[model samples]
Target: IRKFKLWNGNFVFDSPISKTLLDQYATLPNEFKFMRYQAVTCEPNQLAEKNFTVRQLKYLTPRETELMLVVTMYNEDHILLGRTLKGIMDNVKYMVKKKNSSTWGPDAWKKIVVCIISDGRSKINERSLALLSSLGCYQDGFAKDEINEKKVAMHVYEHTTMINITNISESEVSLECNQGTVPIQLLFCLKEQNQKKINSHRWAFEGFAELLRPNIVTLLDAGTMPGKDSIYQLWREFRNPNVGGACGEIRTDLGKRFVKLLNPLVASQNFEYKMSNILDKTTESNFGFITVLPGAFSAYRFEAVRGQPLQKYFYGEIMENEGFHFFSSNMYLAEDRILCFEVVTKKNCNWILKYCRSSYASTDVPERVPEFILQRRRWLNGSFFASVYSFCHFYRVWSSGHNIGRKLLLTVEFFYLFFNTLISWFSLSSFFLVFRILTVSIALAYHSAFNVLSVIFLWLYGICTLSTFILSLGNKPKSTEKFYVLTCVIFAVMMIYMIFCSIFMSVKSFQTEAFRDIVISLGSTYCLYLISSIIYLQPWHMLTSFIQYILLSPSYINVLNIYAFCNVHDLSWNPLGKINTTEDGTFKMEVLVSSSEIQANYDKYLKVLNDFEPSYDEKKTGYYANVRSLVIIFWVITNFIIVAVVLETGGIADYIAMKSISTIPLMTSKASIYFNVILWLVALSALIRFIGCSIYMIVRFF
Candidate 1:
């Protein structure tokens, strides 16, 4: 039979004493029960009260598993996808057999349980809630005003100062049970949703989404007044019977450093190592009134959700995955804020959002731009609504006597939205001002070369970022190599187009009701684009200039780089090139550059050139050398012939436009012929150098 624990007492997972006691409890008899129905009860049980001897139950395994892992299936194809629960079950069974089949056989089975659920394509899967099902509630500390600076926290600021942080924003909040953080960044690769064709009959039920509707008003109403009245009723009926409150906090990867311009690391290993430092900070503090859960995935104490029985949320509909936690729970909402608030406001619910480095393989990325933007907008909208809702009911408590933290949270929530509005207003103002200034300046004077170079280098930085991600994390599988190559091409070509799109989005979003729509859209687009690149990639080792063509298609400029043999007058292979000093004998271009030095001296490096500018003769190398370089013009001749042939074949005589060239100042000068001779001389010198080096090495070995 299944058993339950009544933890009306304090519980600390990380405490050494708590760990020891839990391990010790595992040694008890099968029927033994441990219950601390007291909040501050810290003392261990008496030896006789332990109910079982430590020796007999030392390896005792619990009879059933408490966790469930679920996935969504939109169609038959989703069901057939790999990485199913059956595979997981098979692996677990095999591992158990390998450990100790004879002594622990069926008993080991009792310890772990697996549950799988699928939405089967009704209402979309709530990724936030799904993630919450994995990681349980854990809480930490935050100053009242701290949350205002965060992009996620800024979601709540919709109106003027609404809540008083002093009344509700307490330091050291608790994370409620069964809530979790989701760090699945699937920005580079994920399956896409095809909404082009929809079968109306498929809309039989909204699976996981049913769990979210029951407490929608109380849970989702950050601004409603009458809706706030429903919160207390929710608390009375659904709160956990043991724990008193809940809390949550966000977690970040402290090891990731920005790579290239976009990725976190590439090229410079030393620099990469130096950049991998992640830092996490808490935003809000509400030990008594936890409003959000921090999670990479989902977690929960199943009793609360199941006890409520989400009948209202589902209405009347049948689904393939109707029993899944998200859809089954009375409070089936997703995301950190909804989960934390639901549990915290409930009576006897003590939970905290714990942060952890995940060991699982899942997406921390969104599938498409619209999905990501929608999710972000919802987060902001929900947060704002939450604050407004809180203020309506808690106004008496807030106005009578509230702490600084509570007052600050309320004020910032409404004020933060105003800040984003300000950004929109200012951005437009600056855009017009800059545009006018630039238009006038361009007409009056020449643009500085430095400005042009700066733009070029900035563009190059983005190129470097893309290259770094592909070279490092991309091409992990052969199937993705083609996608990787395609991504490079897209970057080269669509970058300019994307910039224009971004500008348009910004302009349009300012006029739209959704303030940050453009920002969310851009983030989603980039994520989707990245995923497409990863799924359809080419081999990275087969590196070629084709990557350049793929990237630069939209710009109309096709770069053809010609690298001719130019034998160095005097040099040796030393990885980083060396430079000669001028006649003044000052130290030449500094040769050895550490990664840090490269970053610090990037501008300096670009300017690091020979101090002595070449005289006219030296710069020319010879008029013939310049003319020899003119072989590039042969490409035009080749294009002309191709076009002419195509035109004739098509019977379109006027397709070819003829032009006469008789303006050559030197029709037959030695300077032109002599240029060919100079190239020949350089080529001959290279051959001699190669042969001499080979012979010298051979002689040295002998």
Candidate 2:
């Protein structure tokens, strides 16, 4: 028996680290993988999982059964609605008390606080305002009085001592909601405004913790819930050095009415599916925390979210966004993904937190649909921001006090999000340009620079995407794996969408002066997009014009089809139900059924912008119209290229070269190159459209 003597100082022994050792036991499983890091079939070693014991501090006592509740109402029924709303709040309070007393003992009974928030429906009615003042409503009382409920939800929250509000990003926080109100952050997203807000949940939570902080544990809603026991076991088993968080297991529950309706009908289901697929790939690392913590419930550390003696980062103006920022950039540490990857990748076998998917429909409310869309849009707006901010200083991030592979992965991820196409095209185009201008002899001498650039670009998407995709396949059935595969294509499309959305969000942030205005401006930014498109189109000549045409084609088709299906009078944002109902009435939700509203639906997002204003999203209609107009632009560009090529190539050779690029010395002019590029674009578009059509067929079956 050989026992190696232990050292005092920390060490980065990059050599064989056995999983069998007590230290490495959690991170090693031969079958499981975190990227390229190999795990042992036998014993291995890694870091230990973090555990925190929370002590209850502050909450209202059961003796005071009355909980502060606020409800939003719009019209004359304020008195009636308020009474009904109060009954709902009281019942909730009793149930919470009963549930807590049975499970957490008497301590929980004494420390109980329930806050119910409701929008007076729209306009702040007298009853709604009375609820805030008489019921002692906090946080959104001002918002309730000033803004309409349709923009943001009238929040229902209870702050508690044991609550673990992990700031995942500027916009999101994670907490335990089922057991209590643990505000756990959902950090990674594709939205810019939500990302920038960094404290969305907190902004919604205003003074929620100030009155009485509650101990919280979030029970996964039907759709988001995962298996519990397996997740906790996995949490105990897998440990990553760089990983700060671990997401639990998941299950799909589409048996319910809402789940069935939503899965097929709403585009968001596609969005969520794509997100799950992408996360599966990036989340296998042991070091960085899982992007989402999956479970029937996720346990969080109170100290992580609570404002420390010296750390003011918690509970500040934008605390939610800080979760991802802090975790990702914890004292110059790598992104959370990199950290978790470094920790868990060494564990050979996959560490899965089993979960059950729910069948219930969560976002079917016609009144709340726009808010949900805004929430999703907010999420969609962040991806590019994360990549850009993190990548701006790549070296500092890459040189982590953790695993090298994790750092590399983070850097690669940054490139993929912010600059994949740019990097690829730059290298490809530069090479061709240089080679054409300078003969082969000269080009050979400078090949190393281009080679390095190529390596970076190829690996940026190749290795990262491949690794994420392959790891996503583990611990799942063949059918699940097929979705994982299809997600790769979906991920590609998302990236394309993300680039433009980020730009739009960024422009709004820069132009707006205040937070309220910023949000409103973001909502209104839709108005300018059309003008921006036309402005953008004006500068481009042949190839750029065609690219714009292809990109806009899909959006045009989708919006117009939706308008036609709804039987609207025009292409305005104002949509009428199938029955031509005019004012905020009758909406249908499901794949088989299309939702239609009488008033403009955008009103549901930003309260100030609710009334049908031609100035608002008429641009959206015009934007698509302009996009459809790009078809003409493409035709003009192609014909121009063909004409130019004919003049350059003396007709015959130019015609053949249109289909392919051939080096013919001085014979091949710029016009000939342009012709070839246009031809390539046309062919690519046709192929993609065909592939998209085929995919629709395949999905119908699957």
Candidate 3:
């Protein structure tokens, strides 16, 4: 009989007993007579002492084939696909080498299986299929081997079948677990349905739930590629008992400085991802709190979500009231955040979400300015809604335990939302002020008083050059003082040129067709060079990259705000191009139709939300209210003073003398006063917000 360990201190299962047979031997306590109760042979059998090295006892029972790799693909380019595929194979080979190096045999690599879920409607070209077959995947018509010594047992399927299986209580078709000593397996699952109908989370979840050994699963976007050691690093974290999920650092290849120069738009996006993930996200992870656990490259322990059905796990919902039927509402966007939420809240066991820094995965970034803007809009929209949902359920979150990190994180987030709500509305005030100044100047020209004010304005404009020079001295090195002085001279010349062009444009006498056209062209060229100086000579790139998330186009910001308020959870790509009209007249109706009715629906829903929930904290509410009150009161006074001045002057500020003044006046007195007053209020609002921003930054730093 084979040796067995004792079930209790005094008794032993002498014949290697299975769990099913343990009950038959439990009753005869005094007698340890049967082979099932016999103890293993030892050199010096001290009956009381239990020291023995049993032969034929298995330790390291082959790691239980723990890994399943899932990759989702859309209509991908062949070149990108090649790069992504190569990276994956390199990772696989590295894992094979690392595992075989240990005492484990060739089957060590059998622990991992890879599946590529593709859109069945998007035809794979013959050349691409050949590439897939050559790369070790069994092609469309080929049959998969049940067992193989050193090759991957590959299978390919339509994703539609998986979705159907997930909806059913029991699947008629079962996966064959013929998990032998195979080195690897590759499966290409293509979903044969309308591309627009495929929900990525549901598709992936259903496929993952089908795995025979539900130990671990890794999700990857088709555009992303994990470094050779990235998977290995993620797998190490899963070895911990409480680590429910872990993700590798993800960054963009276009973020490198050299690449940035070639493509600034792509580079800007890449830079944001790099900085946010490396600094903000890494710090958050240190406290055991991660916001999204991005799907680009992340791994999860299957056991953490074992009992939950694919429907409940894949389709995320928020509770509205007490009854299950009426309370639950589906979440559309930020499915990853919802999954993280469920893993932390629903998994009866305590679990931690972690970040691994050993290796990183790289993904492609949007290459154009418009595309990047659309991408950021979607993210910001989802981020806002997720934060709101988290805040609402703060009590449930706090009781989860190991939640200090999340609590602190949400506190900062709530404050940021408060500040952004106020600041986001007021930051564009300067633009309105600029328009007002132009309007008053034109009105003065028409009223025959333009010459008087123009002379005074030019004097102040000239002083600006000297003032700018003095300001530059604080940061200039002594050795570079002379060079800086020379640079200021050139700057002054450009400033004078811009002023001259503006004065010429304002004069009706110089408004001839040829003269106006030439001046306009010259002015445009000069402005272009001036902006180039800001970008290159100053640290404009660093400033913009840091704050670009908030420095968004107003139209996009409007969409983000509305989307968050609507509690929209439907995740879609390039939302801006779909919901918002583009400069070019095309729309992405395949994703979703934009409707004016959405605005009304969202407004009503937000009204209810406001009525139902009380303030999150009194301290924050008071501070926010005080800041807004101060700003509004200051704005009104500033506008009143400006309106009084314009009204008293009557478009005739003749304090300064001008020879032979003539009128080509166009601005009416009432219009002048009204516009000037509105502009002044906006300017005042901007100035106050700037001061608030400055103080906030200083406090944060010190």
Candidate 4:
């Protein structure tokens, strides 16, 4: 090996076969590939397979990995990138070492590959470029102090087909092994065009991952860092043989460098992130059908995705003729979910996706309203659109090799997916119902002063809320300049609704008593959520976030949904983000399901906002629920009942209650006690695992 030193103390090496000589063995493809430093396939490039039955994995002799870790960085900043790289390197160090001994096998590093792929190479922020350049990894000229390419040797045997390739950025970190120094591999891949995250992922998959032949391929976005041993916990899931993909808890790194813990915006997301894993993800995990393996820090067994899942995942790139034109765009935004559905729903793969509760990754979240609005637009729009695709195709789940328990869980996903759409569009029904309860309370209290004042206040807010719809009719793209105007208006509307509830919940003894059953049910769930969270290891997050989550429902729900749908067509990377966040130039971009809320039942997302028409959502909520006048009278009633029950308390809580309380027990649990036990059993086990994990986590503190 010809060794060369980088500007940093680290060394980079050249393969024994000189760059010019690599082509000499091109006649023997195997030898040529070996010289290029990629996986050499003995047979055709086929996905590896395994036996049908799963056996328990032993800890001392855990499954070895051919882990391909890729980090996608768009125009993110240096602080975020630096922390990310260090975090990844730390995990690599852990995996390279043996648990039983202080020493590691000499070949441990060979199975792992690290690729940091930065897209829109020209437009990438200088802070990030400069940082990578300082580390002698990035090739972008924006780096004020460039690493001298002539003096430093690039880690050859990388993916370059020819010696003439300009920016083959790869470096080595030498680690101590039993035999000697083993070089842990890292690659810096820079793409010239700025095609957003999805395309960057596609490049990584096609260029490196396909050739690298990894077992478990892990993804981390720039600004996100994996926890030490998180990769191990993630990797451990693949040992089950059936698990195709898995994700770890993605904690919001509050009180970290720039973000604070008390910022309600950040705090709610922190709580939101925590509970999502604790409740939704935990439930999904028990059945092995995780809906979305979040790309922030998720891992997938390469073989599970090798076939049709891989092709379908890259559909946005190749979707021209395949034409589901309307939804193709929405699927593009939250494309990560597409990969997951493809994995679980593959023709006969029988692959399962999982969530690893003990493993985690921490990254910053949007701390300001504008950033929060924009980020949620992307996530919300992405999730909703992708969900429609999955909801319609749920029959595929029936054919999968899941047990009876999971099959039923699969059915629940089918309903939850569709129901979420109805709730999204007519979510106002929830607020209005609270308005009803609160208005009724005042009638009982016979407080004429407060009653008259409530009506006048609703009239004023209703006038403002109703007026924004006229602006929505304008097609001029620039109409978006007034985006925040609508956002503020809706924010005001929610504030009014919240204030109304604050009064209703405290009004009188008769009032609280009238809604006591609803209150108790809601209170029971809240107490359970917190109690379970403690066992689940997220003790303090819920209380801190509840205030904001409750008060800010308007922002997250009403205002956010409005902003997201209005600008769905504007899928510019981080559309209005400052990265404190930022985005790149655009793609031909018009496919957002933006505000297509009134698709009746056949809509793209299955529900669009229906002000004029009464669909299933409107009929179920109330035929007059869509009437602007009713909103003036109803948001109060809706919320009072909701102080009655909102986890989200709006449509989600009310919808579950409405859809079921009036009906569900008739069949959900009547089938058989054993069958019903499976449902609660999963819930019970999640409660148990939470406590078990907490005990382990706290003990590690010492």
Q: lDDT scores for all predictions?
A: 0.28, 0.30, 0.46, 0.56
Q: Which 10 residues in a row give candidate 2 its minimum summed lDDT?
A: 35-44
TM-score head-to-head 2 vs 4, winner: 4
Which lDDT tens digits does candidate 1 get at residues 1-702?
A: 544343322221211112332343343322222211111111112222322111112235412332222332333221122223223333334333545434224333333322222232233244422322212111112112221242111000000000111111112212222112111101000012222111111111121112211221111110111111121222232233443222221222122332222321122111211111111111122123334321222334444333211222223113435122222221212223433344433333333322211111121222222233223334333443345344433433234233556445544533433443333223222222222222322322335453453355346534743453343222222344454345435435344434443455456557532215435544544343333223223122112222232334321111111111011011121596676777798664655478887776876766676453655444434433433334334533443343334223233343332323222120122322332333343344334333333332343347
- Model 4, C-alpha of 556: deviation from truth (Å): 1.2
Model 3 TM-score, all chains together = 0.48
Q: Which predicted model would earn the best TM-score?
A: 4
Per-residue error for 325 in candidate 2, Å, reads 18
User: Which is superior by TM-score, 1 or 2?
Assistant: 2
TM-score of 1: 0.28
Ranking by TM-score: 4, 3, 2, 1
Q: Please list the residue runs of candidate 3 whose C-alpha ends up more than 4 Å from where it truly belongs after superposition.
A: 1-63, 99-106, 123-127, 136-183, 195-200, 255-260, 293-295, 307-313, 318-330, 401-702
Candidate numbers, best lDDT first, in rank order:
4, 3, 2, 1
lDDT of 3 by residue, 1-702 (tens): 555444533232332223232332232321112122122221111322433221112224423456777777667654455555556655665665554345224444455556676654345445445444433332243232222231211123211010000110111221111212122445555444434312544544543334335478878876677787888778888767988888877766654444553553454455456544544444445444456535358887877755442344444443334322211332444446655655665434567677676768877776643344345545654564455555555555455545566556544544444444444443333222333344345445465555555455446433643343343222222334444334334334433443454565447555434335434544554343333323223323344353333232232323223222222222221555427667897565663246766777888898998986444355444444454345445643554445435433333444322323642233436544444444344344334333433333343347
Better of 3 and 4 by lDDT: 4
Clash count for candidate 4 is: 30
Those runs of model 4 whose alpha carbons end farther than 4 Å from true positions after fitting are 1-65, 101-107, 138-183, 256-259, 293-295, 316-330, 401-408, 440-444, 463-507, 510-513, 571-702
